[PDB]
RNA sequence: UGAGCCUUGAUGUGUAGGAUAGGUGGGAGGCUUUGAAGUGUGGACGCCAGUCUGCAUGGAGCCGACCUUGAAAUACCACC
């Protein structure tokens, strides 16, 4: 499931992972495959940390950032 | 008396609208006998039309893509 979303005047952006259907190595790999689908666009003028801080969650979860 | 921090909140009428349209992960039923819609009343906010909570009442429904619409739900959890 591609998905192409737009970031905010802010920066914060997030884009859809998937249901709670998918499993925990699942869900891992999905978040790699996006990180470095994302760093791999860096821009010179992004001086500073590329990714902050990510606020995943779920139905009944709660923003957490991970490695 | 200035400055900051994990957390909980309050405010979000471009005009096309039931009317005070920030959006994103989740998302087409969450929430409500771990008591929801309707009443008198107090403070916050706002584009003086209107939103949230305390008090007592009621104690079982406002809300859905609802009809419109550039952006959709403040149907629910977290972010800013």
């Known amino acids: 499931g591609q998905?192409?979303?737009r970031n905010d005047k802010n920066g914060i952006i997030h884009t859809?992972?998937?249901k709670v259907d998918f499993?925990?190595?699942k869900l891992k790999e999905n978040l790699e495959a996006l990180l470095v689908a994302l760093?791999?666009?860096?821009?010179?003028?992004?001086?500073?940390?590329?990714?902050?801080?990510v606020?995943?969650?779920?139905?009944m979860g709660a923003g957490v950032?991970?490695?």
């Open 55 to 59: 606020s995943i969650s779920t139905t």
């Open 23 to 25: 499993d925990a190595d």
């Open 3 to 5: 998905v192409r979303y």
């Open 39 to 53: 760093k791999k666009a860096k821009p010179t003028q992004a001086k500073g940390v590329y990714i902050k801080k």
């Open 65 to 67: 950032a991970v490695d």
């Open 16 to 18: 859809t992972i998937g």
